Every structure is written in C-alpha cells, then in structure tokens.
C-alpha cells in the first residue's frame, strides 16, 4: 500500500544523510524503489509533466538504475521527465539519461563545527541571543514523544500565521501542517511570558551529518529579532549534539527567456523563512541546486507544472 | 472596509449581465472602483503581477478610466499589469494602455430562447433525461433560504469529491466550498435515492441575461449520465424561469507561447466537462483572452495567474 511505501522509504530517509529527504513523510508524494529496495525516487505528477523531488535517497549504488527507470516510466505515460532541485551529485545520472541543467538557487550551508559563538566573528549573532532573552524570549526543543503535549498551541500559532499571512498550505517541497506529520519530527519552539510564540519542525536522520526545517511560523505578535533568537538557538542546539552542518535552505542567486523565469521562480518560493541577506549572516558555504529537463523549453514548461505541484497540488495523507 | 466593498460589488454584479462576476463574493480578490463608484476591476496580486480577472464590471461609461488606473496602479507598485480572460470588448481598452492580446480559449455560450429539448434537433439529450430519471435521477435548484438544510449533506459530498480526485480548493477564477460563499447562491443539486449525488452552485444576475455555474461536484457513486441529466435540468430550469442564456464555461481550444497556452487550458479548462460534451448543446463559442505589454510577459503572468488559481490567498 501507499502508507506501507512512506513508511519504507522513512525508513531509508533516517539511515542516509539528506535532511529534506523526510518531505516523504507528508505522504504527497508518489515513490518508486530500486530493484533492491534500498533506494526511492519520490515525485509528483502535474498535467504533462513527472516531476521528482530533489535526488534519489538511499544507496548510491542504485541511483543510476533509478533516474532511468523514472526517465522511461515518465516516457511511457506520454510526459516529460523532470528533477527539482537536485545536487551536483546527481548531475551525472541526469547527463547519461539526455538531461541538461539549470540552476535554480543556492542552499546556504552551515559549518556548525566551526560556528563559534563566543568568538568575534559572530558577536553581533551572540548580542541578538542575550538580548532576545532580555526581551523574555526562551527556546526549547521538543523530542518527537513531547509534541503531544504542545499541539493545540502548535495548532493555534500555525492557523493565526495563516491568517495574517492571508495564505493557504503548500505541497510537495514544502510541508504542511497536518497533525500526523507535525507529531513525526522534532519542534524547536519559541516561548514569551510562558506561551509559544515561533515553532519550526526539525528534519534530522540518525547519521547527524545535515538538519534542516521545514515549517518555520511565528505569531503576529512574535518580538523583533525572532528570526535571529530561534535560528541561533536552532544552530547552537544542533552543534551541541554533535550535528555537522545545518541547512538554512534555497535562497535565489545574487538562457533569458528561461532566465526570468528562474528569477521569479525563486523569488516566489525561495523567500518564506528568510531573505538571502539574512542567512549570509550565518556565513554559509553556498552549494547550488538544479532543475534537469531534456531541453531549454521544457524547462519553462515542467517549471510550471513543478509551480502546481506546490502551490496547489494533491490533497495527500490527512488524519 | 474590504467587506464592504466586496458588499458594494456585488451589489453592482446584480444589477448587470456577466454571471461569473459572482466571483466576488468569496472575498479573494481585491477591489478597485472608478470613481463614481458604479464600476470595478477585481484582481490579484502575486510574484511581480497584478492580474485583473476577467472584464471590469458595472457601468461601461467608466471603464475606460479604470483600466488606466488599474495598469497605472501597477506600475507605481513596480509590477507588471495583466488582464486573465477578458473579453473581445475590452481589447481596445487594454490596446490604449499598450498591452497586446493573446486567445486563451472559448466560451461555450447556450442561447436557452432556442434550446428545444422536445425537438429533433436535441434527441439525444431529451432521451438522457428520460433515461437519468428511470436510473433514480431527480433535479432540484434549492434558494438561498432553503440551502441551510442541505448544507450539512452538501459538505460532505463536497469532501468526499476532494478525497477521491486527492485535489485540494482553487480561488481567484474558481470558487471554493466556503459556507458562507454557497449560502450566497441557489445551489442546483442531484438526489439518487433519497441522497445528494451531485451539486453546482449557480450563479445569475437581476437581469437574467446570463447564468452560469463554478463548483461542480458529483460523488464518485454517481450513476453514468448524471453530467447529461444535471446539465439538460439546469438548462430547462433556466429556460422556464426566464433566462437567455447558460454560460458553459471555458474550454480549450486545440510557438513557446502556443504550448504555454496548450498547456494551461488542459490545466483549468477541463473540470466542468470537456469541450466534446459543451458542444452537445450547441453553443456559439466566444472568445477570451489574455492581455499583457509583451509576448514575454505572456508567460511571465501566466505564471503569476496560474499560482493565484491554484494556491493564492486565505480569503475571507
């Protein structure tokens, strides 16, 4: 079944190293395996367009059997054959299956093993945190088996940002807030005068070599200097437990036609938990991230299709 | 206030012949009156476009000026103007604000004067109805007043639509199943048994120049030629009760451009049945059409229009 397919693939997301890999867990997604059932593609299927999220997740050694086998069954249903955002690593397979490449954005990637608080580089990122404090701002975060107990107040601060924000739940690269999915994940919270104010799920894999978030809300009346007290409570936290690196997600770039297209693309959907200046704050390495389509004019095509997808999309798993 | 203006427009909406200017009732779209306040442009915004939908509404004499407006608006607030599904009309319009027009698809409009179900022309049809009706089929248009009752059972079979197609809620060009937005309209609905199978809610004027209907939703139990049934019902419904016309809706209508517009009429101009069963009844078909400055921006705002539909706003 469907469900047993998420619960398999969880399964191989926690014992790799990609983060975002744990968007399988919404249940939104389709997900094809390998022969050997130790690696999944996951995508979605929008008008004429198959549309794989990010790269194939598990063993490296059945990537290039899996791309191709996407690749063709997108080819026998009549459409066109698409990845979304995925590394350099990937690149490669895409070549050998006829695909060309266009970048979309960069991760900002934090080093946490040499993000030293206390030292001078990051002074002002210290100043923020003692004066969040001063503001009475607290952070937590809250293990799996303690969501439970926050959920309604999760729920509260979740539905108040929809409605300030005057905007609906998205899809497929972007998780939404459905119970079943919030109780799977870690939550760091913010707190002031003893209420939570900012929450942000946690997506880790037992390896510890990336973390990453996936929602990231705050209330209307959230203190200036948020962003700053939970992202640096989020890194320090991270560090801590012995994470290598923390990813702070795709932010736009700092051939026309298509061009303009990129640009707005990431514009639209790059900028939900932070503008690009603000991250360069961190001093992130910045890795790019492709979209891998057969020609130039499919790629504005599929990228449409691809805007469906998380805009709209499918209704997925719902408790 | 925005609920008094969206109040305001509908008010406007009653007294002239679009049927889909309705729209404006579920409070998704900004408002921008002319100045007498007799007319508006009802829009979007999103990305680096302000996307008008359809055609301004109200008093002609004022819509020369409210167009202007509208792109001056938009380009004081750095975006680009685009006007999604207008009509032939307004094409000089637009054309005095340099924007260029590009055909998105066609409207199926039914002239209901001339729409004889008893008469050979219409023999397939007229036999639809009589065979939905052996399958159990029954028709009714429920008022404003009498809709509270079916409301529960409409929710449901409005969820279970959702659950099956595994889709979720539209805005801007569509409406979305929002209680106090289907307590607005009749709602015409179809009974297997003594159970909604299907409904639509429709959508008139005062003048009774035109109606038309947005959501359309039939359970997944619903017998093959409820569309039939629910359609040739909606039809002489209409047709006794004094209207000239029932608007079908958009189609599609089949060179980066072309494929574009290829593409986005499978993408929303297929959810209340497609061109082949529009044409059944016979319609004169319309054209529509998007306007913006430049081929380029064509794709651009699309874009832009195409986010609006699918995600967009909260809403009221």
Redesign the interface.
């Known amino acids: 079944s469907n469900a047993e397919d998420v619960e398999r693939a969880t399964d191989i997301v926690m014992r790799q190293d990609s983060a975002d890999a744990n968007l399988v867990r919404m249940g939104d997604k389709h997900v094809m395996f390998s022969e050997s059932g130790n690696a999944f593609i996951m995508y979605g299927i929008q008008?004429?367009s198959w549309i794989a999220f990010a790269d194939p997740v598990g063993d490296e050694e059945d990537f290039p059997d899996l791309v191709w086998q996407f690749v063709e069954a997108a080819r026998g249903a009549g459409a066109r054959a698409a990845f979304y955002q995925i590394s350099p690593f990937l690149l490669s397979h895409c070549a050998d299956a006829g695909l060309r490449a266009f970048k979309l954005g960069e991760l900002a990637l934090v080093d946490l093993t040499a993000f030293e608080l206390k030292g001078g580089k990051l002074a002002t990122l210290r100043q923020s945190l003692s004066r969040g404090a001063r503001d009475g701002l607290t952070f937590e975060v809250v293990e799996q088996s303690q969501v439970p107990d926050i959920m309604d107040e999760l729920q509260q601060v979740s539905d108040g940002w929809?409605?300030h924000h005057?905007?609906?739940e998205?899809?497929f690269s972007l998780g939404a807030f459905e119970p079943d999915y919030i109780l799977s994940q870690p939550v760091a919270v913010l707190r002031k005068d003893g209420k939570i104010t900012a929450f942000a799920n946690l997506m880790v894999t037992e390896t510890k070599k990336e973390a990453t978030i996936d929602l990231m809300r705050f209330s209307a009346d959230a203190p200036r200097g948020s962003m700053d007290f939970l992202f640096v409570s989020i890194m320090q936290h991270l560090r801590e437990a012995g994470y290598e690196s923390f990813n702070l997600g795709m932010a736009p770039m700092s051939w026309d036609?298509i061009g303009?297209?990129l640009f707005?693309h990431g514009?639209?959907f790059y900028n939900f938990k932070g503008l690009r200046a603000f991250k360069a704050k961190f001093h992130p390495k910045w890795e790019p991230r492709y979209l891998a389509v057969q020609n130039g004019?499919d790629a504005?095509?599929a990228l449409?299709?691809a805007?469906?997808l998380?805009?709209?999309?499918?209704?997925?798993v719902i408790g």
Do not use: F, Q
């Open positions: 008008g004429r929809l409605a005057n905007t609906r998205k899809r036609r303009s297209t707005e514009e639209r004019a504005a095509l449409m299709d805007t469906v998380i805009s709209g999309g499918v209704r997925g």
